[PDB]
Each structure stands twice: as structure tokens, then as C-alpha cells.
Amino acid sequence: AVNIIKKRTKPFKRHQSDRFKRVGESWRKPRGIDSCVRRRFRGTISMPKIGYGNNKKTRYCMPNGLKAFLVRNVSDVELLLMHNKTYAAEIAGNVSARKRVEIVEKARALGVKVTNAG
Amino acid sequence: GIDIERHHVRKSQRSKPASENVYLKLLVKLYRFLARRTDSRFNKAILKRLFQSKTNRPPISISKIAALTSRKSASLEGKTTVIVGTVTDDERLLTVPKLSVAALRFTKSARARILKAGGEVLTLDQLALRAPTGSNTVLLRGKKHAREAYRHFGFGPHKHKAPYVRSEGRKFERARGRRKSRAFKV
Amino acid sequence: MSVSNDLIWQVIRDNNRFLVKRPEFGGIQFNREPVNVSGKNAQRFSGLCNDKAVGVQANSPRGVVLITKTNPKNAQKPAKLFRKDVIANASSRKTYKSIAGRIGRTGYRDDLVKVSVARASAILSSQRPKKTVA
Amino acid sequence: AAARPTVSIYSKDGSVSSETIALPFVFKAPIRPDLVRSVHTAVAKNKRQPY
Amino acid sequence: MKFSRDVTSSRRKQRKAHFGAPSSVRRVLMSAPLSKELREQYKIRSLPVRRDDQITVIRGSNKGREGKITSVYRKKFLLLIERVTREKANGASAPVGIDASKVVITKLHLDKDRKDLIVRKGGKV
Amino acid sequence: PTHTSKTRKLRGHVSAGHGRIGKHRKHPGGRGKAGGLQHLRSHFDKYHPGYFGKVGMRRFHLMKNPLWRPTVNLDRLWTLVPNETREKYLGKNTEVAPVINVLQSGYGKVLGKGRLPDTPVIIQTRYVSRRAEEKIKQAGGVVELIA
RNA sequence: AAACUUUCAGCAACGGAUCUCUUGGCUCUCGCAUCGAUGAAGAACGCAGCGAAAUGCGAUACGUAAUGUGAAUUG
RNA sequence: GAGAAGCUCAGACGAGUAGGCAGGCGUGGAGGUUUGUGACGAAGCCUUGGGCGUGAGCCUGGGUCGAACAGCCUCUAGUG
RNA sequence: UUUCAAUGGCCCGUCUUGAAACACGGACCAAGGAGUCUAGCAUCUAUGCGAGUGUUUGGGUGAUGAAAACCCAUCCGCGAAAUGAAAGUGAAUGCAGGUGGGAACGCCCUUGUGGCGUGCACCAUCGACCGACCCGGAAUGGAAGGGUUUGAGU
RNA sequence: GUACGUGAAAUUGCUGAAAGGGAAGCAUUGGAAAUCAGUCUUACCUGGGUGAGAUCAGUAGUGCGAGACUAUGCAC
């Protein structure tokens, strides 16, 4: 949770997804027998590989050094009582406005940071 | 670049059992500790065999145990036999001697006959208490190549192995290529 | 009589009502059982295994209740297995000292004094009045 | 020696009675989640109707 | 739990038998609870509704209204109650249907057959 | 189950493991085991020698019941008797000797593998090998033949 | 500088994916044995206050007798 | 203590078609479990906002919407 | 995020020695769309039991509610014996043998990669034993004696 | 609003933004413009100012030896 470095912030888009709407952006390994991308010719897009993996100490951490724990109710927030300096509460999208208020209050009581407050 | 040729790179051995038996996991836990905190080759032998598959851990019968521990120049008189595997009975041995055996499993008949003859049966954790380094122990194994598949492995011209045949008799692979009167023999 | 505590952990290390496991962050696990002060899924902190174990829960409206497991003769009697001592209306200095005495100075779970005090501290911090900022 | 692992019997009003039963030997059987899962996987298929 | 081999818990069959019920079957399906005073008087919990019966609405926007049953629209499983209407665009008043299960009968249109139905159902006159 | 199958791993790999050059065509060397004498000979002659041709006499309408004769060796003879009978006679000196009727244990011939303890026993069998009979007689017992 | 072309977003179209549903299908099991020259199966033409397709029916024609229910039908 | 399936110290190494193996991601349905989410808005969809993962993917703000739906351990397949 | 500048970047899929090809498919988008299930066989793994193993051909608690669970007898399959075309015959000289290597254990050194004694598994090897075959070989039987051989044996 | 639940994509109109000398798209790096997040110095500890208060360390007593706890009082 100190000095968080990302080896890369660009997302690795699928080859030719910029040219055909039928080709989604989500990454696919090119397997063509002539593929210039698979062969890594200069000037082509990069492919995901294990060398891009981030430091094990800072992996998964948000910029503030915390990791965003999803919470669906008050009891999920109570799970983060002792882990106040390592986990932040992320309130689920399908939690009602009433329950969301009770969650925000419980997190504030425990000193748990909430990523999506408001 | 570096010119490295890599043949024995990844070790080929099991580092843990494939079994999900929780009690086998407890025995491994015991013998991981014993093999690490002692200088005994016996404990490393037990730990390694606790990982092995069923086919690599053949059974042994009480007859073989009785024979192996009763040789003329033995001195294996009052020592505990240990096998990481199943101890079966041999009903052909009409009178069982007094034996001390430590094993993973005992067949119901093997266990009853060992006890009735005044002997004793131990699990491997009981063995660890009695001989924490395996001192004055006879470590034994069953016959690895007694299983059916080894009748067939290596079959080929003039190898004298067993063929894979659906049935046995004349008309089932005893003709051309198996005798001189039919072209050639093997 | 006893079913082994090692055996119980093997059964419940990945399957129990009190374990909340998520695949995020590479696989985190939380333990929610009442007699687990640390809140982490491990054999030594699980009250379901250990003959001696402690838990610190919140007591309404102030203070904490110290939960402890009685002598293992009650292992088969769940009604007599858990002891719940209400340490409430004491100050923070008084509360931590009693927890340390009951758990540590008795030799019960000396390994769990620090975690228990920290857990009681956090519960007490959660119960304080809210200085709401209008 | 004498194990004496008895189990108490409770009356219909919740009070423990004076009668006990020795703990049946089956309660000392090995507890095997791997075996139980394998058997349960098979047995739970045996009510299925073909489609 | 049901145990009879002659009873179906199939959702498909139950829904088909309800929405495909013939006219005489739909009469029993459109039953209403009797009022507390009527339950004691006749020892009967509920009856198939009937035209010219007196009810009060117990659920919905029209809860608390009272009136005769002007018609029993069985094709729609609906009751039409007197003076329970709504205004159309052109000022005409359109009757508003209410489910039989959502009213309670406060006065029965007793007649020879209805009297026979009370005694047959174990009730009193 | 399908979830753990190799087919699931080959999704996105165009040739499904069967090669781009040679492919996964319909039967490219014929159906079944056809061709053992011609283009499959190098397999048949290596792994199934003796496959082709005839050996021996035919026997029309073979009926296996008159040929029924499972065998038991001497080393199993005392295992056919109950535990109480073994304790009463085996190793003791008695005026009567136990009768082991091998036919009621499901055997038609007594063979001679193994050894016998030194107690008399009467072995009732349809058939017996020569060496089996000699070892029974050395133990003080006898063979009595039955039908 | 516009117009024009191109991309993105909002809004509006075009289109009918998606999601949820389901008096339908499919499959299994259990039970049963009953067509016709006393004219069947099938076909045609007709029958309702306002009815063409379906259901039903046959000049006694969305039916007569008989039995049960017991106030509807409904556009 | 550090899910002993854990913890800790160190060194070397990293092209890949056809092909092989492993560990993962996602989908429909089944058992178990989670005082699980939900008309005070489930699912779905849009997005000129945010976050996580090398990646498969995942979480979230705002908009739209109207009745169901999800996490964890297992089972299963007409599963990308 | 958009755009600009500088530098790089040919159209993917495919068969191919070789595709940017003046080789073929591909105007666009949605939804659908291809290693399955079954009778076997083989290796490997897990589980149960083990000289045995396999309750589901059947029968029972059974009527209640029962396509499940659970229980129960005789057979039978595979395995516990091979060999021979067959008629047939059918597995211990010995500690169920000897030799070499060898796991594990014990003892001696004296700090070596030690010597000594048992020797599991496995492999190589010399024998013995059973069947077939080839011998001599003193009406029917083939006992002792043999063999360079032979068997998917002990 | 019956051309009716939700209402995707291709494709289209309007509005806004931006770019454009014989394609466009992409990658790297920054400029420019637009837009997003830090809520910090919260907690805990001590000192300083005043304030009121059932008042705290050792003890007395209520499971024999030692240790923790609550509870009646004193210690004011």
C-alpha cells in the first residue's frame, strides 16, 4: 500500500476490433498462420503476457492503497472491522437506497472507507 | 542469448498425495515434520511413499512378512515390519506366527489373524511414536510388477509378453506369426 | 472422548457457514464465527476447532462481551460449551486490562490477548457518539 | 478399560432424564468428506428422469 | 404436502384448469368469505357469490365500499358492484370489476336453493 | 463431466487438436480393423501375431458342462473346512480324520501345488493329480474317489 | 468562413436483439382396450338474432329428450 | 499466527506453428449454504464517469426499466 | 477522452516451401452455429473391499406418499492354474534356491564418496518345478532317466 | 397510445464537439483542451485553559497455597 506502480495502464484491445463492429474489444490471442500481431512485428499492437504482472505487494490496490471489498448488507461491512487499513467497502449496485444509507452509516462507525459514497 | 540445454529441469516426482483423504493428509503432516526435523532416511522414505499412487503401493500379505522376517540369517526376530500400503491375509499360511506390523491398512482377515496369534497391528502414527526414526524396523514393499499390466508391457516380436486378446483359445492369435507351420513364429 | 481438532479443521477449512470467501484480490477469506477474535480463516484462530478459544462481540448499547469456551468436558454439550462475560460500562483502560487478565494471566489464550484487545478497541470506537457535521 | 461414553436422554419437556445410552460405535467411524462427496455425487443422480 | 396420486401440483396443469374452467366450475372458484356475524349465524366460512348479494370491498382502491352484486362476469372472474364505477373520457361511468376473494358477504340473497346449499354445507338456517 | 473435458480447452484453437496439414477427415485408412494383411500389416504383425489363419480341430456343438472341472491345490485344502473343524483336528491326534469333500466346495480335481500339514485327512474328489495323491498319503491321509 | 465527409455523445428514428414470462413442446412412468353394412375413418354441403376460420351440431341442425347444478350469457 | 493448501531465504532462466499438459475466466440448469439482493426498483440495456486483473473477465457512478436475481462449496451440460 | 506532431504499422482467415498478393472466403449487424452420446478396449489416477470381489435378473420393509433410500437368498461374471490342435496331464531338492547391483535398519570405525551384517522393490543372470515337443527306453498305464528346444506358466 | 412490456446492433435525422491538400483505422511519446480523484491536519497518545462529578493505586471481607475477573465499602 506504499508507492503503487502500474507497469501499464492501457487495456490490450483485440486486433482489428477498431475496424469491425462485429469484433469485440475483449482480448483474443491471434492464431492466424500469417498473423503479424502474433509474430510481434514492429509497430503492431502488444499482446498480454506474464511479464506485465504487477508487484505482488501492490497488486489489486486502489490508488489510496486499499482494496475495494464488495458489500451487499450491513453484515458484509462488519466483516471489515479489523481490516480497516487494508479494505474499503464498495456498496453493490443492486442494494436499495434505504439499505445503502444503513451501510454508509455502519462503515462510518467502523472507520471503513467507502469507495462509492453518494 | 544463453546456450543452455535443459533435460532434467522439472522434477518428475510427486510432492503430495493425489488422494483427498483427510486422514492421509494428517499422516503426511506428521511425516513432513519428522522427515524435516530428523536426519533419518527412514522418515524420508515413509513421507515419499505416502504420496505414491495405488499401483506404486502394492499390497503385501502376512505370509510374505512372515517369510521375510524369518530367514535363517535374519535377526529380524522381534522387530516391527512397516509397509506404506495394505497388508493382506494369506489363507494358505494355516498357522500365523507372532508378528508386529505397522501398515496403512489391514484387511479384516489379516488384522484378526495377526491379533489372534498374539501379534500387534499399528497405524503409521503409532509407529512414529514407537520408532520416531524407524530404528530396528523392517521397511518392506509389495511386488510392484505383479499387476496384470506388466504381463503386457513391452509386447513385440520375440519379447514373450502377453497379447491383449478378448478370449483365450485356438482361433485367438495362435496362427500365422505364432508358429512355424503358419509362415513364421513371432 | 474426542473427535480430533485437526480433523475438524480439515473438514471445515473450505466449507463452513462462518467462512466468507471471495475470489477477488487473488482469493481472500474471512471467518465470522463468534469465537474467532482475529476474523481470519486459520486453524489456530477458529473456535470450531480449538478446545480453548475466545471471541469479542459488541454488547448493546455500550461495551463488549467476551466469549470463551468452557472446559472440554462440555464439548458435546453446546448449551454449556460457551461462556459469555459482559465487560461493559468500564472505561477503555479498565476493559483491556480485564480481557488481558481473563485470557492471558490465566494462561487460557495468551496468544490472543493482543488481537482481543484490538478487537475490543475497535468495537468501543464504533460505539462512541457520532459528532455529525451539519 | 471402561470407556463410559454415555449419552443422556431428554424428556419431552426438555429436562435431562435419568436414563443414558452408551455412545454407539458408529460415532467413532472415520469422517471422510472426500468419500462422502463421491458417494453423494452418484446417489443424487439416481432419481433422475430421462430427457 | 400432497400425497394423493390423483392430485397434480403441476403449475402448468393447475393454471390450465383454472383459466380453462367451464362456467359452472368458475362459480365455485369465485367464492367470498362470509362476514363474522354471518359465519356464526350460518356456521359457514364462505360461499360462491351470487347476483343480488350484499358485499363490502376489503382490498384495493375501493376498500370500504358496499353494495349489491349487479353481475357476476365469470368469463373474467370479476364481480360488478353497484355504485362502484369510474368515469370514462366522455363522462359515462364504467363499472370497475373486483375479485370475489377481495370482498366479504354481509347479506346473502337467500332462496330455496341457497337455503339448501347452507344445510348441505353443514350450516344452519 | 463435460466441464473438465479437453474439448472445452480447444475452443478458439481452430483445428481442435487434429492438425492443419493432416486434419480430422473421415476414415482415411478404412473402417474397423480392415487391412491387417496389407496396409495395417506392420501393426498386426507387431502387436497381434497369430491373428490370421487357422489352427486346430473344430468341435461341433460344444457343451461345456461335461467338461466342468475347476481345480484346487493342496495348499488350499485345509482352507475349505470350517474354522471349528480346523481347530478340532489340525495338529491334534484323533481317532477320526476330517473329510474334505472338494466337490461340494465347487472343485472337480485336486492338484498338487503346495504342501500339507502332517495331520490325516480324507480327500473326496472326482479327480486328483498323481503328485497331489502322493503328498496326501505322506501326510497320513487318503484320497477317496467320488462321482 | 460555410457546405461536405468522418468519429463520438445526447435526443429522435429504423429494427426487434436482450431480459423476464409461458393454458405450448419434448421426454419418462403409471393405467386402460372401445371402429365399421345397426354404414366407420375420411370427404362435401348446410345449421346461430347479428358468425367467416376453429368448436359444436344435422332440416329436431352452436341442438331435442333425460340427469345434475342452480342464475347466468356477454361484443 | 500468518488458509502448513501457510510462512520464509536464495539462484538460474523466459522465441514459438502443428501438437501436449496445467491453472484460471465466462454461460444454462441441480444439491448445500449465505437472519444473501430486490417494487424505497430484480433482470436487462445505454453511457461523452470511477476502480481491479498480464488476460479471459469483474466491480462501481449516472441514465433507462419493471419482477425477479446473486456470492461461496459441490453436481451437471444442447456452455463461449 | 479527443486531436495534433514526430517515429513505426500492408488485410484478416486459409491451404502452402512461400500470401499484402494480380490465390480463395469475407458489404453490414443481431440471434443460431461444429469432438457429442452409447457398446467396447488401453494406460494413468481416486475410492472400497481383498484371495476374493460384484446389493439394482430378482425378492422385501410397501400401505401409508415411495422411479429414491434401505434390506435380503440362490446362481452367475471376473479373479484364485497352466499347457496342448487334441485325447490329456497339471506346478517346492533347498530358507520356495544360487549369483550381482540395491531401499531401509543395525554394528564398527574415525572423520572420507566410509568398512561389516542382514537384505524389500526392481533388473540382469545360473538352476529347480508344470504343460507341449524331441529322445533313448529297461493288450494296457507311462513311472524313473534325458534334451540343443518350446509356453501369454510355477 | 393498440405501428403498444423491455427496446441492443447494423442503419438514419437533428444538435453539439472536433478533425480534414489522392483513403481511413492502430501503436509509442508528449502538447493542447475537456474531464476525474484526493476531504487530508480524521483516529490514538500527551501537554495547555476552565469546568463539574456515583472518584484512583495498596488494601478489609465474601474456592487452602499463587494468578485474572466482577461485586459491598474504605481510600474523598
Ligand SMILES: [Mg+2]
Ligand atoms: Mg490495466
Ligand SMILES: [Mg+2]
Ligand atoms: Mg482445418
Ligand SMILES: [Mg+2]
Ligand atoms: Mg499429406
Ligand SMILES: [Mg+2]
Ligand atoms: Mg514461451
Ligand SMILES: [Mg+2]
Ligand atoms: Mg440447456
Ligand SMILES: [Mg+2]
Ligand atoms: Mg436495476
Ligand SMILES: [Mg+2]
Ligand atoms: Mg458507444
Ligand SMILES: [Mg+2]
Ligand atoms: Mg494491473
Ligand SMILES: [Mg+2]
Ligand atoms: Mg453447441
Ligand SMILES: [Mg+2]
Ligand atoms: Mg512504414
Ligand SMILES: [Mg+2]
Ligand atoms: Mg506448413
Ligand SMILES: [Mg+2]
Ligand atoms: Mg495470409
Ligand SMILES: [Mg+2]
Ligand atoms: Mg491455393
Ligand SMILES: [Mg+2]
Ligand atoms: Mg480453393
Ligand SMILES: [Mg+2]
Ligand atoms: Mg467474395
Ligand SMILES: [Mg+2]
Ligand atoms: Mg451467438
